[PDB]
Amino acid sequence: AREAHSQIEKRRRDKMNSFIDELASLVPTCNAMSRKLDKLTVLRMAVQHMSDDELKHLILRAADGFLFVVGCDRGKILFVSESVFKILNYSQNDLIGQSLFDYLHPKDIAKVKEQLSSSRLCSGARRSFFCRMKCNRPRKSFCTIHSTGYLKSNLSCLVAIGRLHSHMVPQPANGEIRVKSMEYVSRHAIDGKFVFVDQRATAILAYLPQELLGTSCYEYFHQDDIGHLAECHRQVLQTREKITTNCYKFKIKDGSFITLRSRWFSFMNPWTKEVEYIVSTNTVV
Amino acid sequence: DKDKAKRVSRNKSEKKRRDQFNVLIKELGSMLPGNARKMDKSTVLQKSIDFLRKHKETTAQSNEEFTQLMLEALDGFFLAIMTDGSIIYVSESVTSLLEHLPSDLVDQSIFNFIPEGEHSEVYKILSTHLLESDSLTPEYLKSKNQLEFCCHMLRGTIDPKEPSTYEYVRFIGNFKSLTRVCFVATVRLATPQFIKEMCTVEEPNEEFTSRHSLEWKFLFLDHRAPPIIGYLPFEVLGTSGYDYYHVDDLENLAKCHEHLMQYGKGKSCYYRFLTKGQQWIWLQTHYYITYHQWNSRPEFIVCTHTVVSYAEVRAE
Amino acid sequence: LRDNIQGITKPAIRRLARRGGVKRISGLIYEETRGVLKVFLENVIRDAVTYTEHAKRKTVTAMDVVYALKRQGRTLYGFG
Amino acid sequence: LRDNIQGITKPAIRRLARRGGVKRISGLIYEETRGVLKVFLENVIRDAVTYTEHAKRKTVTAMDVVYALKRQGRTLYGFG
Amino acid sequence: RKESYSIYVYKVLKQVHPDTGISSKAMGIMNSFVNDIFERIAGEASRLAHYNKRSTITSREIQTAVRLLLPGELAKHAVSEGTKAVTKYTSA
Amino acid sequence: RSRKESYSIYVYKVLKQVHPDTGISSKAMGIMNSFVNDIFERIAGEASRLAHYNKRSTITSREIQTAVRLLLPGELAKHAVSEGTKAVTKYTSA
Amino acid sequence: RYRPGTVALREIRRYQKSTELLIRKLPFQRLVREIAQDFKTDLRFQSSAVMALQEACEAYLVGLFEDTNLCAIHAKRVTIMPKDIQLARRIRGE
Amino acid sequence: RYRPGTVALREIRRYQKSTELLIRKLPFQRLVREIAQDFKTDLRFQSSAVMALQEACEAYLVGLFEDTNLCAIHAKRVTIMPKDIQLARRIRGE
Amino acid sequence: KTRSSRAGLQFPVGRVHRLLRKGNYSERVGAGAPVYLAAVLEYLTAEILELAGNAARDNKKTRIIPRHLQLAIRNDEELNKLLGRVTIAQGGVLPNIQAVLLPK
Amino acid sequence: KTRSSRAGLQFPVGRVHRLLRKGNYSERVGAGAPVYLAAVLEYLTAEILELAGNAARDNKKTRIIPRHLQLAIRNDEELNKLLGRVTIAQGGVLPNIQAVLLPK
DNA sequence: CCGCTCAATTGGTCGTAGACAGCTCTAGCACCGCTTAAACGCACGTACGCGCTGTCCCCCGCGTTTTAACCGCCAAGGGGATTACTCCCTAGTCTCCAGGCACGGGTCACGTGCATACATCCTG
DNA sequence: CAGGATGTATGCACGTGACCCGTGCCTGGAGACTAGGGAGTAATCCCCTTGGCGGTTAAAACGCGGGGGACAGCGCGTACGTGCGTTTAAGCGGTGCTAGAGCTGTCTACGACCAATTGAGCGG
């Protein structure tokens, strides 16, 4: 019985050796080598030895804005796509090897430093922010760029696409088809101060998130609509029920007004039975 | 002092060699197709032998991170349909943009989602275009196969009572023959989506833990949350848990928490959480309450958060 | 309340030590003894209370003290 | 069987004492240790045998040793 | 209703010391003693039956428990007493 | 042939969820089996007495929780009680 | 006056002969409640429970003192030190 | 020559590090039979039973030795005496 | 006829039998089991009472008190081993003083 | 489906239930009791194995041996309280050396 | 001592836990031959245990003063103990099938032996 | 710098020791269902603990004196530790035999259970 066992071990050794030599035969370097390579070396060389282009065109033709890569340690631009010349009018040679902070607006640089900070691309590494970037051809010295991307590992960097969205809304919905309008979410203190605002608001309101937070919605509401909106505000504080406003004008960064309609409610935290904030969903008319 | 560890140095060295071999076996096996556990080393090498044969042949006869990034920035998805309108493939990103599962689109007619007044445009685009390729030039490179057109598409929904709602999208793509002729395009929403819902979890299962005060403020956040929610513990501590919840889900969660206040234990409804990366992620949470021994009254809430798929949310 | 451990007076400790056959006591003993007694009481009380809580009672009975001592390896006779 | 207690050698005792962290041993310890061991071992055996007798068996099992140790507050893991 | 051994303890005391009475405090001690020994034997007998896969308790388990639980001199007497009691009981 | 129950399956699985890169010796496994039955008896015994002391005829999570609070050190008891609470909650809810 | 140690031997004989509690009852009751309040407030206590605790506590401390006395004697000391108590406690399993 | 006590330290470290039985197994097995014959002659033993006894015995003695060592140290001594063993056994109520 | 009487015992066989059936000690209890046990309980009880009665007499008392039970149990080495972990309410302690404490 | 699966437990709730229903611990066993206990057993098991796995790696081992279980138990104050009187086959000891013995 | 149960005991019926007879193989008991690490006995050196002197300061004994403890009384009412009804929880029953377990075959980790080449070193 | 000789380390093959997968498979877990006893609950009571009021008093707090005990320092010698050679019996690896452990099947005497009777035990 012991003899059978021992020869089974021989069979195992023989089978392994047979496969190691066979594995070696598939590696050009191992096959070219005259000498009988050791088992460790064969395996090392074997692991070294171990459509997408169609998709590349499919996605690139649909591409918009520009890709850029910026280092987290210094804000240095490591790469940018040629399409950036359409948007910022700077060339690849003007941006690469220079700090992104040299092109960002001073108020947005602080936000980018925070965005670049760490916390198949995973959502945890995901970053998305609006910022103002300098243009080679000029307030018009800057344009508002939406930057969305993920943090990537020697120098850590953000890989993101910068997109220059139109402040105008192209192709209005047809009356025949029920089409979802543009929307943004914001939340307000009891006195109407922004305590939260999203990027959709910035695309719609032109104001970047830091330009809205800590200010009253009444600073942007048109006085013709404030009387109505103020009534909705006074009422919404009294109820959990959603109150929908009429269409109203809201001031945007470029100094113009746009027409919005919004649904408001006062959210109560059941643990304290207290209103945390006014919650608003705004809709573009 | 007395000489020692001579035997240990030799035994360690012999063992070190065995460890090096074991590392290479693991590495070699890891790259294989048809990966399985409990394979013997002989099987690992045999599959590695066959893999190298297949790898050399397939590469001789022949972008992910970029493609994901560009699709998200564009607020778009790949969509491929037959001339007959039947959908053959769609990128998962469509679920975040139009709330459609791949299972809702694939094998279905595209005209089920296009408004009836726009059917003729897409039927014309599919039916008018015909091309036979030569043996030298790939179809995608031919300007004849490249096409750009726009149409509306119906959105999916969790609650079917919601009135039919559509999105205007642009198709940028090319015609390709399959072993019939399909059209494949990146579909971009004309209306930008600066915030979207994560509908599929990148891992089969993931979880994170937190503790909350009797005001529902964060008392604790574990090391597992930040990879999921993007926030480090100090970024959430002292803030209300509600600050991260979706506008519609705030009310349903309040009801769930009221139930928890009543029984001290339970499970939440499905809800969305706003990540630092500005994505809404669908979650479901298990809760229990811990009590102050002196009087057996509540002191804090312990929360176990499970990330869930859009399909799981809509299923119940 | 508080500070009732000091209610275990030096003489009270002397008497106990004498029953134990102790002829002479250092001053450091008295504080040490109080510490030990406090722990002992905490152990018995914690268990006696635990029994009381399980029974959903608010009054601690001698039987709970007995059950606490029994599980601790100490058996006391004459209290039911 | 006699004098098998001598089977517990002085070196064996030294080594056990070393495992107990003992640096230095008086000569009287070796016999004292044998005496104490004899008693401890006897107490366990008497119980193990008693279990065996109750079981109406002629062979003592490890389980009887475990039970004998268990009731004596010498719970042992690894033998079931 | 509550039960005690005070009747039986008293009767036993009069067998050994007819001239002697018992205090209520001492009686409390004796009742605790009887219940404690009952628990010790009943517990040991239960474990013995368990270890031998027996569902029934017999005099063998108790005798064994007595031999295990009691000191040598007490065990010898207690066993003879139990043996006599069962023998007499069976005969009567 | 006869069959004997063991916890070896479950002890193994638990380790694989904690330290997947490690295994268990046969002696260590025998020790863990000895440990599980010991603790089981301690809890089941304590729970039995608690039912007796309160003239109850049924063992519930309350007896076990109490036995756990009595038997374990406070740190382990807190965790063990929470785990027992969660397991029952999840089970009864499904 | 008597030379020190003579009175102690008289006291030892007296207290060993005695059975009554050597510790003051009311201070003890306050101490019990002071401790018990930490596990649960608004507790009530039977007078029998208090006596049970006092009897158990004195028996415990006296037993500890006996072992403590032996330790001091073993060290060829008459006066007992905290270190004698700590050793006895450690050996006893505390 | 190694100075007195340097060997003992190496031995302590070595024996504490190891897990092997220190008592010679056959002598032990005979000792078990030598005692067991007093309760019942013509008695047989499982080999595992003998090892179980030995492991319990060595563990017991080691525990006793550690307490004994503390007693000698408490006395400001290094050498352990039978007196130190007897004290430890008395304190543990053996 | 009373089972206790058949066994020649003072202790109640019926109560013991019931107590063995209670407590969940077993699924079944042998008829001779409570008889054997009652004899043991009675025997041990008698040993303590007899010794305690002597202690009472030594103290010139005609009634047993916990002090007497304590002395009897602690003086008898077999009972001391059996009940060495037991505490007796108002038992006091044995009058033991170490010789090293005595004057010389 | 197994109750253990329904409770998210690894331990055999069905086995635990049988073991609680047997052994005469009570006349009846609550349906939730086995689940609660299985969770406790699993928790304690995990705590020991977690420490043991560290002990193995701290010594460059990939295999848990009795020594690791002993070391884990004696180093962990709570486990040593629970298992302080327990002896382990080939358990070994903590490397306790008194300062008076050490060179200085 | 007096009154009144219903706990204790009788005498059945019933199902089965254990005793009993029997067989099957396991592990222990008994013994030998050979290897050599542990065990024994002896020689030599000194660190450690022990006894002793001599400070020096800590505790014990005693008195006197002051404080809370015991003892006794009281009332307030809360909580444990009790009895009465509902119903729902799990033991008990029957059934089905797959998860955990044992046995066989096969595989991996280990030291240990050996071949072999390279490090190195002695002298020309 | 060369060649022959010696040792370190690399590399492999070797079988044993430890280990796991597969196949079988059946036992025991889970599911469905019911019966009726246990537990939960409401409604009640009234015994015991809480709490205070007041006085008497021993017990506790505090202060001082001075002898006794704890302790440090010093010296003595010897019982112990350390090293060595010699020996032996413990380990190890066998062989050889079967008493006893352990499981299988039969059948009984046994205790559980219930209806009936009665007189030892409990309240006052």
PDB file of all heavy atoms in Angstrom, chain K residues 24-27, chain L residues 98-102:
ATOM      1  P    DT K  24     -19.220 -12.307  14.143  1.00  0.00           P
ATOM      2  OP1  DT K  24     -19.432 -12.136  12.684  1.00  0.00           O
ATOM      3  OP2  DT K  24     -18.254 -13.319  14.641  1.00  0.00           O
ATOM      4  O5'  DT K  24     -18.842 -10.900  14.780  1.00  0.00           O
ATOM      5  C5'  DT K  24     -19.543  -9.719  14.357  1.00  0.00           C
ATOM      6  C4'  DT K  24     -18.576  -8.668  13.883  1.00  0.00           C
ATOM      7  O4'  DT K  24     -18.085  -7.916  15.014  1.00  0.00           O
ATOM      8  C3'  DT K  24     -17.332  -9.189  13.175  1.00  0.00           C
ATOM      9  O3'  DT K  24     -16.903  -8.207  12.218  1.00  0.00           O
ATOM     10  C2'  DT K  24     -16.327  -9.356  14.311  1.00  0.00           C
ATOM     11  C1'  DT K  24     -16.784  -8.357  15.372  1.00  0.00           C
ATOM     12  N1   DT K  24     -16.828  -8.804  16.785  1.00  0.00           N
ATOM     13  C2   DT K  24     -16.785  -7.811  17.737  1.00  0.00           C
ATOM     14  O2   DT K  24     -16.732  -6.625  17.451  1.00  0.00           O
ATOM     15  N3   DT K  24     -16.813  -8.247  19.034  1.00  0.00           N
ATOM     16  C4   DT K  24     -16.888  -9.549  19.476  1.00  0.00           C
ATOM     17  O4   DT K  24     -16.923  -9.792  20.680  1.00  0.00           O
ATOM     18  C5   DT K  24     -16.928 -10.544  18.435  1.00  0.00           C
ATOM     19  C7   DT K  24     -16.980 -11.985  18.827  1.00  0.00           C
ATOM     20  C6   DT K  24     -16.903 -10.134  17.161  1.00  0.00           C
ATOM     21  P    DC K  25     -15.545  -8.352  11.361  1.00  0.00           P
ATOM     22  OP1  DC K  25     -15.761  -7.779  10.009  1.00  0.00           O
ATOM     23  OP2  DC K  25     -15.014  -9.731  11.523  1.00  0.00           O
ATOM     24  O5'  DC K  25     -14.519  -7.433  12.156  1.00  0.00           O
ATOM     25  C5'  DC K  25     -14.747  -6.015  12.217  1.00  0.00           C
ATOM     26  C4'  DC K  25     -13.988  -5.403  13.367  1.00  0.00           C
ATOM     27  O4'  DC K  25     -14.220  -6.160  14.574  1.00  0.00           O
ATOM     28  C3'  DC K  25     -12.470  -5.358  13.188  1.00  0.00           C
ATOM     29  O3'  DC K  25     -12.108  -3.966  13.094  1.00  0.00           O
ATOM     30  C2'  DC K  25     -11.913  -6.072  14.414  1.00  0.00           C
ATOM     31  C1'  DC K  25     -13.069  -6.073  15.390  1.00  0.00           C
ATOM     32  N1   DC K  25     -13.121  -7.213  16.317  1.00  0.00           N
ATOM     33  C2   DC K  25     -13.106  -6.979  17.697  1.00  0.00           C
ATOM     34  O2   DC K  25     -12.966  -5.820  18.119  1.00  0.00           O
ATOM     35  N3   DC K  25     -13.236  -8.023  18.544  1.00  0.00           N
ATOM     36  C4   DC K  25     -13.360  -9.261  18.064  1.00  0.00           C
ATOM     37  N4   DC K  25     -13.510 -10.256  18.937  1.00  0.00           N
ATOM     38  C5   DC K  25     -13.355  -9.530  16.667  1.00  0.00           C
ATOM     39  C6   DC K  25     -13.231  -8.489  15.839  1.00  0.00           C
ATOM     40  P    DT K  26     -10.643  -3.371  13.380  1.00  0.00           P
ATOM     41  OP1  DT K  26     -10.534  -2.046  12.722  1.00  0.00           O
ATOM     42  OP2  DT K  26      -9.644  -4.431  13.087  1.00  0.00           O
ATOM     43  O5'  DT K  26     -10.704  -3.161  14.956  1.00  0.00           O
ATOM     44  C5'  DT K  26     -11.797  -2.418  15.526  1.00  0.00           C
ATOM     45  C4'  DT K  26     -11.328  -1.497  16.622  1.00  0.00           C
ATOM     46  O4'  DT K  26     -11.091  -2.227  17.849  1.00  0.00           O
ATOM     47  C3'  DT K  26     -10.033  -0.758  16.335  1.00  0.00           C
ATOM     48  O3'  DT K  26     -10.116   0.532  16.965  1.00  0.00           O
ATOM     49  C2'  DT K  26      -8.964  -1.647  16.963  1.00  0.00           C
ATOM     50  C1'  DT K  26      -9.701  -2.458  18.027  1.00  0.00           C
ATOM     51  N1   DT K  26      -9.502  -3.929  18.061  1.00  0.00           N
ATOM     52  C2   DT K  26      -9.724  -4.559  19.267  1.00  0.00           C
ATOM     53  O2   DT K  26     -10.020  -3.952  20.284  1.00  0.00           O
ATOM     54  N3   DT K  26      -9.589  -5.923  19.245  1.00  0.00           N
ATOM     55  C4   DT K  26      -9.263  -6.708  18.162  1.00  0.00           C
ATOM     56  O4   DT K  26      -9.219  -7.929  18.273  1.00  0.00           O
ATOM     57  C5   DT K  26      -9.023  -5.992  16.937  1.00  0.00           C
ATOM     58  C7   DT K  26      -8.635  -6.765  15.721  1.00  0.00           C
ATOM     59  C6   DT K  26      -9.150  -4.661  16.943  1.00  0.00           C
ATOM     60  P    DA K  27      -8.881   1.564  17.026  1.00  0.00           P
ATOM     61  OP1  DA K  27      -9.426   2.942  17.105  1.00  0.00           O
ATOM     62  OP2  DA K  27      -7.921   1.211  15.949  1.00  0.00           O
ATOM     63  O5'  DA K  27      -8.219   1.207  18.426  1.00  0.00           O
ATOM     64  C5'  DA K  27      -8.970   1.381  19.640  1.00  0.00           C
ATOM     65  C4'  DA K  27      -8.204   0.819  20.810  1.00  0.00           C
ATOM     66  O4'  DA K  27      -8.094  -0.614  20.658  1.00  0.00           O
ATOM     67  C3'  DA K  27      -6.789   1.377  20.954  1.00  0.00           C
ATOM     68  O3'  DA K  27      -6.694   2.084  22.208  1.00  0.00           O
ATOM     69  C2'  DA K  27      -5.867   0.161  20.876  1.00  0.00           C
ATOM     70  C1'  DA K  27      -6.777  -1.053  20.923  1.00  0.00           C
ATOM     71  N9   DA K  27      -6.439  -2.080  19.938  1.00  0.00           N
ATOM     72  C8   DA K  27      -6.016  -1.910  18.645  1.00  0.00           C
ATOM     73  N7   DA K  27      -5.773  -3.031  18.015  1.00  0.00           N
ATOM     74  C5   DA K  27      -6.053  -4.005  18.958  1.00  0.00           C
ATOM     75  C6   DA K  27      -5.966  -5.402  18.920  1.00  0.00           C
ATOM     76  N6   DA K  27      -5.579  -6.088  17.845  1.00  0.00           N
ATOM     77  N1   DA K  27      -6.290  -6.079  20.038  1.00  0.00           N
ATOM     78  C2   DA K  27      -6.678  -5.387  21.113  1.00  0.00           C
ATOM     79  N3   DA K  27      -6.805  -4.075  21.270  1.00  0.00           N
ATOM     80  C4   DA K  27      -6.469  -3.434  20.144  1.00  0.00           C
TER      81       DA K  27
ATOM     82  P    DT L  98      -4.554 -16.035  21.913  1.00  0.00           P
ATOM     83  OP1  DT L  98      -4.608 -17.160  22.879  1.00  0.00           O
ATOM     84  OP2  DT L  98      -4.800 -16.289  20.470  1.00  0.00           O
ATOM     85  O5'  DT L  98      -5.564 -14.907  22.398  1.00  0.00           O
ATOM     86  C5'  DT L  98      -5.479 -14.401  23.739  1.00  0.00           C
ATOM     87  C4'  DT L  98      -6.402 -13.221  23.917  1.00  0.00           C
ATOM     88  O4'  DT L  98      -5.959 -12.116  23.083  1.00  0.00           O
ATOM     89  C3'  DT L  98      -7.858 -13.493  23.522  1.00  0.00           C
ATOM     90  O3'  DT L  98      -8.753 -12.914  24.477  1.00  0.00           O
ATOM     91  C2'  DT L  98      -8.000 -12.758  22.192  1.00  0.00           C
ATOM     92  C1'  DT L  98      -7.080 -11.575  22.407  1.00  0.00           C
ATOM     93  N1   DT L  98      -6.619 -10.870  21.194  1.00  0.00           N
ATOM     94  C2   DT L  98      -6.586  -9.496  21.242  1.00  0.00           C
ATOM     95  O2   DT L  98      -6.872  -8.863  22.245  1.00  0.00           O
ATOM     96  N3   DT L  98      -6.186  -8.891  20.079  1.00  0.00           N
ATOM     97  C4   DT L  98      -5.814  -9.508  18.903  1.00  0.00           C
ATOM     98  O4   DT L  98      -5.478  -8.837  17.929  1.00  0.00           O
ATOM     99  C5   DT L  98      -5.858 -10.950  18.925  1.00  0.00           C
ATOM    100  C7   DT L  98      -5.460 -11.702  17.698  1.00  0.00           C
ATOM    101  C6   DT L  98      -6.254 -11.552  20.054  1.00  0.00           C
ATOM    102  P    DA L  99      -9.101 -13.656  25.861  1.00  0.00           P
ATOM    103  OP1  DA L  99      -7.911 -14.426  26.300  1.00  0.00           O
ATOM    104  OP2  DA L  99     -10.408 -14.344  25.697  1.00  0.00           O
ATOM    105  O5'  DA L  99      -9.304 -12.430  26.854  1.00  0.00           O
ATOM    106  C5'  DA L  99      -8.170 -11.716  27.384  1.00  0.00           C
ATOM    107  C4'  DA L  99      -8.575 -10.333  27.837  1.00  0.00           C
ATOM    108  O4'  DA L  99      -8.707  -9.435  26.707  1.00  0.00           O
ATOM    109  C3'  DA L  99      -9.914 -10.262  28.554  1.00  0.00           C
ATOM    110  O3'  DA L  99      -9.873  -9.170  29.486  1.00  0.00           O
ATOM    111  C2'  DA L  99     -10.893 -10.012  27.412  1.00  0.00           C
ATOM    112  C1'  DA L  99     -10.081  -9.192  26.420  1.00  0.00           C
ATOM    113  N9   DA L  99     -10.287  -9.500  25.003  1.00  0.00           N
ATOM    114  C8   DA L  99     -10.784 -10.645  24.428  1.00  0.00           C
ATOM    115  N7   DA L  99     -10.816 -10.609  23.120  1.00  0.00           N
ATOM    116  C5   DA L  99     -10.314  -9.357  22.810  1.00  0.00           C
ATOM    117  C6   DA L  99     -10.092  -8.710  21.588  1.00  0.00           C
ATOM    118  N6   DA L  99     -10.311  -9.272  20.401  1.00  0.00           N
ATOM    119  N1   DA L  99      -9.612  -7.449  21.624  1.00  0.00           N
ATOM    120  C2   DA L  99      -9.353  -6.899  22.816  1.00  0.00           C
ATOM    121  N3   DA L  99      -9.500  -7.416  24.031  1.00  0.00           N
ATOM    122  C4   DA L  99      -9.993  -8.662  23.958  1.00  0.00           C
ATOM    123  P    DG L 100     -11.164  -8.687  30.317  1.00  0.00           P
ATOM    124  OP1  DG L 100     -10.691  -8.063  31.575  1.00  0.00           O
ATOM    125  OP2  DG L 100     -12.133  -9.812  30.373  1.00  0.00           O
ATOM    126  O5'  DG L 100     -11.776  -7.552  29.385  1.00  0.00           O
ATOM    127  C5'  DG L 100     -11.022  -6.351  29.134  1.00  0.00           C
ATOM    128  C4'  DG L 100     -11.700  -5.516  28.077  1.00  0.00           C
ATOM    129  O4'  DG L 100     -11.744  -6.236  26.823  1.00  0.00           O
ATOM    130  C3'  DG L 100     -13.141  -5.117  28.395  1.00  0.00           C
ATOM    131  O3'  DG L 100     -13.191  -3.679  28.469  1.00  0.00           O
ATOM    132  C2'  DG L 100     -13.962  -5.707  27.254  1.00  0.00           C
ATOM    133  C1'  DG L 100     -12.948  -5.922  26.151  1.00  0.00           C
ATOM    134  N9   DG L 100     -13.246  -7.044  25.266  1.00  0.00           N
ATOM    135  C8   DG L 100     -13.605  -8.315  25.640  1.00  0.00           C
ATOM    136  N7   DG L 100     -13.789  -9.117  24.631  1.00  0.00           N
ATOM    137  C5   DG L 100     -13.543  -8.327  23.519  1.00  0.00           C
ATOM    138  C6   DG L 100     -13.578  -8.655  22.142  1.00  0.00           C
ATOM    139  O6   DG L 100     -13.821  -9.750  21.622  1.00  0.00           O
ATOM    140  N1   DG L 100     -13.267  -7.558  21.347  1.00  0.00           N
ATOM    141  C2   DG L 100     -12.958  -6.306  21.819  1.00  0.00           C
ATOM    142  N2   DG L 100     -12.701  -5.364  20.898  1.00  0.00           N
ATOM    143  N3   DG L 100     -12.909  -5.993  23.105  1.00  0.00           N
ATOM    144  C4   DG L 100     -13.212  -7.044  23.892  1.00  0.00           C
ATOM    145  P    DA L 101     -14.560  -2.834  28.479  1.00  0.00           P
ATOM    146  OP1  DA L 101     -14.378  -1.699  29.423  1.00  0.00           O
ATOM    147  OP2  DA L 101     -15.689  -3.773  28.689  1.00  0.00           O
ATOM    148  O5'  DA L 101     -14.636  -2.269  26.992  1.00  0.00           O
ATOM    149  C5'  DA L 101     -13.542  -1.490  26.472  1.00  0.00           C
ATOM    150  C4'  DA L 101     -13.856  -0.945  25.100  1.00  0.00           C
ATOM    151  O4'  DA L 101     -14.032  -2.032  24.160  1.00  0.00           O
ATOM    152  C3'  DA L 101     -15.129  -0.114  25.024  1.00  0.00           C
ATOM    153  O3'  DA L 101     -14.923   0.964  24.096  1.00  0.00           O
ATOM    154  C2'  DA L 101     -16.172  -1.107  24.520  1.00  0.00           C
ATOM    155  C1'  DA L 101     -15.365  -2.068  23.664  1.00  0.00           C
ATOM    156  N9   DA L 101     -15.800  -3.461  23.718  1.00  0.00           N
ATOM    157  C8   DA L 101     -16.156  -4.202  24.815  1.00  0.00           C
ATOM    158  N7   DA L 101     -16.466  -5.445  24.538  1.00  0.00           N
ATOM    159  C5   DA L 101     -16.310  -5.523  23.164  1.00  0.00           C
ATOM    160  C6   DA L 101     -16.477  -6.577  22.254  1.00  0.00           C
ATOM    161  N6   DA L 101     -16.846  -7.810  22.601  1.00  0.00           N
ATOM    162  N1   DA L 101     -16.244  -6.318  20.952  1.00  0.00           N
ATOM    163  C2   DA L 101     -15.864  -5.086  20.599  1.00  0.00           C
ATOM    164  N3   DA L 101     -15.662  -4.020  21.362  1.00  0.00           N
ATOM    165  C4   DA L 101     -15.906  -4.308  22.648  1.00  0.00           C
ATOM    166  P    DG L 102     -16.013   2.133  23.894  1.00  0.00           P
ATOM    167  OP1  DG L 102     -15.323   3.315  23.319  1.00  0.00           O
ATOM    168  OP2  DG L 102     -16.782   2.272  25.158  1.00  0.00           O
ATOM    169  O5'  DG L 102     -16.986   1.537  22.786  1.00  0.00           O
ATOM    170  C5'  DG L 102     -16.490   1.259  21.465  1.00  0.00           C
ATOM    171  C4'  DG L 102     -17.515   0.478  20.685  1.00  0.00           C
ATOM    172  O4'  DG L 102     -17.569  -0.897  21.142  1.00  0.00           O
ATOM    173  C3'  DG L 102     -18.946   1.009  20.798  1.00  0.00           C
ATOM    174  O3'  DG L 102     -19.423   1.322  19.485  1.00  0.00           O
ATOM    175  C2'  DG L 102     -19.720  -0.157  21.410  1.00  0.00           C
ATOM    176  C1'  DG L 102     -18.901  -1.347  20.973  1.00  0.00           C
ATOM    177  N9   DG L 102     -19.089  -2.538  21.789  1.00  0.00           N
ATOM    178  C8   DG L 102     -19.068  -2.607  23.158  1.00  0.00           C
ATOM    179  N7   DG L 102     -19.266  -3.809  23.612  1.00  0.00           N
ATOM    180  C5   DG L 102     -19.432  -4.582  22.474  1.00  0.00           C
ATOM    181  C6   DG L 102     -19.693  -5.967  22.344  1.00  0.00           C
ATOM    182  O6   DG L 102     -19.801  -6.808  23.241  1.00  0.00           O
ATOM    183  N1   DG L 102     -19.816  -6.343  21.010  1.00  0.00           N
ATOM    184  C2   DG L 102     -19.695  -5.492  19.941  1.00  0.00           C
ATOM    185  N2   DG L 102     -19.855  -6.036  18.723  1.00  0.00           N
ATOM    186  N3   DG L 102     -19.443  -4.196  20.051  1.00  0.00           N
ATOM    187  C4   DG L 102     -19.328  -3.813  21.339  1.00  0.00           C
TER     188       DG L 102
END
